[PDB]
């Protein structure tokens, strides 16, 4: 029978994972499906690990996650469409669950699909190359349990290995005379390190935002965040503030674009990640930005110049989970024959073109938000994928914007309608700053 | 013609670049050479950069050396046999120089061969194959210059990738939220970090001596160094303790076999590295211990399954660019023909085996030294490389264990026999515990 490679466990492999086994279950054949997972278990960046840099087996270390970590977004707008958050707790939970706790709820979803039997952990891809003649793709990995390398032949590869766990780390005069800590967002682990602490941000995104906001919680001195580009813009603390561009160090002194001068104990990059594939060929090697239309991937998932590869979650996200779902769904169903892709390369091309005007057609962030929705939607009309309210999640994105721009610092503390009832979720028992425990424990009591 | 691929250009592949630089010279006809460097220069472990973890490609960060770090054994016992520091420096230096002044040492050296133009730099290896049929490796890198990989054929392989580069990263019960530093030998940078905090080090060898010695040196509270074998056995400093096993850790509470208790800021984990190379398959991957009879290599550097694989500097090192050069140019002589291999399997293994037997015959410190002084003596007695004093390295390394016995923290200040002359080398113009200036500059006025 024919046979399918996905690399990486993490929500998006396991997507495709659940996809198949959803299709098996109506009557459907399916493919061999062989997922092979770095890691030693599934989870993907939802894994803590305390290790930065290399792993125990000296692979690079994937998670990007720290502690203290909890949900940025609603998780009304996260919700798998075929396994609802009630169905997995039983209850209502807040909107904004610890890292633990949407580790429980992804894990929880692929148990009762029982796809577990499909991945093979520990066992980082090394290389794929694909041959004309065969039309098959040759995939090798490494097993650690056994310390051993092999190769076997596929009909399909499906790549979920991610895209924010490589960092982009950018040197600036005097990163390498600095007097004290310089850890990139990929290597932040404890925001308790930096207590009492003068601390830089670099970056004006989502990790500056967070970390700066944990490291303001966990009682940090001072935060200082710089941009490049545009500020964040939000009313910060008392003891946060925000700068232009970093110039150079000197000594401990960071020196700014305006001028401004000052002094900071520790160093934390929010500078971002690159798409980056140490195992494919140039014939197979995705070269995108980080955006909503992601280049050379047709409907977003199928590469345009080998359509028997296919990549997940490759764009950068507002909507996440079920937008993973609605791609896996998707390539299952080209893979399948629900879907015939075309023998146009030319076709291919335009559709992500299109993809890239529309996105650029406006700055504006709920623009963007609507756009990955419009996408969500797209997908998802084409497969068996339940329908479910867009609208709805669409606004409660809307509803955290208004609620980060109002207090940046207490927007964990609002509820959203689920999609499912409408009814506003629970409101959490804890105000965010005060809620020093991350365990699902105490989330959940 | 034929080809020879060498990965890495630190000392052991530029030693073998130097080698056949030196016969192409006598008029030998030699094959081509190309050498693949995933840095942007070359030293190998030699090269500095503040960075730890992925480098700025993403590519795992080879270096391990941190700032301050001076040679740890005598200049004199490491000295080219081609290459004399007199004719590198015009002058004599002392015995003990920084890390600075020892890379240009290595490069003068192949600067004056016009190697060079042998080297791909930012030009990691992805991977290597052999097949039977062609009788050619064929080596598969990529090209961080331009993003692109590629793919080529060889008649050789040379392995000169180091084995001091992928940490060997324990659990102990409590790591993962200890809250405090927990970092690996192999990315400490600064010991300015630790000033004034009580740092654990974890190991009993060369990199914890060190570690603890430069966080002593630059104000550490107190160093408590911990070992699960034998004791690094030094008397060491009034702030510096040396315990058994570590238990585990309860908060900022370390406890160790003995039952004592001591709390502590950082840890440092120098417990050494693994032999790993992610870029082989199994039929050319070296697996073994780090000692002085390493595993599978016939003559210490022919890979006994493929005999037209080598590897230079796999070994633990009490010599170390001598021993390299010695090997390269037994690698070259067997590949030009001057040396011929066993077709005998059995025979390679027997090499091996004797080596082992003999390695592990005693235990004692000089017996180790005097084994693999034996080993570069039998392979400089093998090819055209010059003969020079190893008694007198190993009379150096002699006096080298003697001075570390009686003062750990001042054994650098002393001299030794130039292996040439016979003449002691001057004494430093500033004691070590004194030395705060890392420059090649200062070191050399
Ligand atoms: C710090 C951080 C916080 C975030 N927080 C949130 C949040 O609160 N809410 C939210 O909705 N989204 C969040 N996201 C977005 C996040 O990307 C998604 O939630 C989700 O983790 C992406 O899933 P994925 O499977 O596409 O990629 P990943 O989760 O990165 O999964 C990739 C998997 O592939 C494996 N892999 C990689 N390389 C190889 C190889 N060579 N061989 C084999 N396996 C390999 C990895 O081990 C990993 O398990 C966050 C992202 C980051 C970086
Ligand atoms: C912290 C430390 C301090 C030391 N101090 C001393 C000292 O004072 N004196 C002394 O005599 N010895 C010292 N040594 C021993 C040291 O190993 C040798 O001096 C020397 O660096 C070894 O040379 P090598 O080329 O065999 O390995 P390395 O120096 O490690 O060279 C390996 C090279 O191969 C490259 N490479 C690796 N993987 C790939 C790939 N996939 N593709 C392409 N290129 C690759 C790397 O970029 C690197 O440049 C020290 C070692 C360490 C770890
Ligand atoms: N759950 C959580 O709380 C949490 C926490 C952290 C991260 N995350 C997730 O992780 C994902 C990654 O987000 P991210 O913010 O880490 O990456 P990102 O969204 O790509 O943002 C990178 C930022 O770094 C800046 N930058 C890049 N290169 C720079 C340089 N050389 N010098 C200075 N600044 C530079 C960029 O500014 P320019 O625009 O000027 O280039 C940009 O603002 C997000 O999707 C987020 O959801 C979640
Ligand atoms: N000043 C300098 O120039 C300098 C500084 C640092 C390093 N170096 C070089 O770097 C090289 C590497 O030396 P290294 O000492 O880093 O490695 P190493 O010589 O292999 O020593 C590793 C040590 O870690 C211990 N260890 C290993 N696993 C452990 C575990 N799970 N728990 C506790 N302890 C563990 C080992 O103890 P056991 O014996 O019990 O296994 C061993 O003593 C050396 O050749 C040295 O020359 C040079």
New interface residues.
């Given amino acids: 029978t024919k046979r399918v490679a996905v690399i990486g466990a993490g929500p998006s492999g396991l997507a495709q994972l659940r996809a198949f086994q959803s299709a098996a279950d109506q009557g459907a054949e399916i493919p061999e499906i062989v997922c092979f997972e770095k890691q030693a278990n599934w989870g993907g960046l939802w894994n803590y690990?305390?290790?930065?840099?290399?792993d125990?087996n000296?692979?690079?270390?994937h998670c990007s996650m720290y502690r203290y970590l909890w949900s940025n977004g609603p998780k009304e707008g996260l919700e798998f469409a075929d396994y609802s958050f009630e169905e997995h707790f039983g209850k209502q939970i807040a909107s904004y669950p610890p890292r633990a706790v949407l580790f429980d709820y992804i894990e929880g979803r692929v148990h009762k699909a029982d796809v577990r039997k499909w991945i093979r952990f520990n066992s980082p891809v090394?290389?794929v190359s694909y041959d004309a003649e065969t039309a098959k793709f040759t995939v090798?990995a490494?097993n650690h349990e056994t310390?051993?390398?092999?190769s076997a032949a596929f009909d399909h590869v499906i790549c979920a290995s991610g895209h924010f766990s490589?960092?982009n780390?950018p040197?600036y005069e005097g990163?390498?005379t600095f007097?004290?800590?310089?850890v990139?967002a990929?290597?932040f682990r404890?925001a308790?390190?930096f207590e009492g602490k003068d601390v830089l941000v670099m970056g004006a995104s989502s990790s500056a935002e967070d970390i700066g906001s944990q490291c303001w919680k966990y009682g940090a001195k001072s935060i200082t965040s710089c941009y490049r580009s545009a500020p964040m813009g939000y009313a910060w603390p008392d003891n946060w503030e925000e700068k232009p561009a970093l110039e150079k160090l000197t000594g401990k002194t960071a020196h700014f674009a305006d001028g401004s001068t000052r002094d900071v104990d520790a160093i934390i990059l929010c500078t971002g990640y690159?798409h980056?594939f140490?195992?494919?060929?140039?014939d197979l090697?995705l070269?995108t930005a980080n955006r909503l239309a992601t280049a050379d991937l047709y409907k977003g998932v199928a590469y345009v110049h080998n359509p028997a590869m296919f990549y997940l979650g490759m764009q950068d996200q507002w909507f996440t989970f079920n937008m993973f779902d609605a791609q896996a769904w998707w390539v299952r169903d080209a893979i399948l024959g629900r879907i015939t892709l075309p023998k146009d390369k030319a076709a291919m091309l335009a559709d992500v073109a299109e993809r890239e005007t529309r996105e650029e057609a406006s700055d504006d962030v709920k623009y963007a938000i609507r756009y990955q929705a419009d996408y969500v939607k797209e997908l998802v009309a084409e497969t068996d994928y339940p329908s479910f309210d867009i609208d709805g999640a669409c606004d409660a994105f809307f509803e955290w914007k208004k609620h980060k721009a109002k207090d940046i610092m207490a927007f964990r503390d609002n509820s959203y309608k689920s999609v499912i009832t409408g009814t506003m979720a629970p409101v959490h028992h804890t105000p965010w700053k005060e809620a020093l425990d991350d365990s699902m424990e105490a989330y959940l009591q």
Wanted: aromatic share 16%.
């Fill in positions: 690990t305390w290790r930065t840099g290399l125990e000296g692979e690079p270390v090394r290389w090798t490494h310390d051993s390398t092999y490589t960092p780390v040197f990163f390498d007097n004290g800590r310089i990139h990929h290597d404890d308790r390190e690159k980056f140490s195992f494919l060929p140039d090697r070269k």
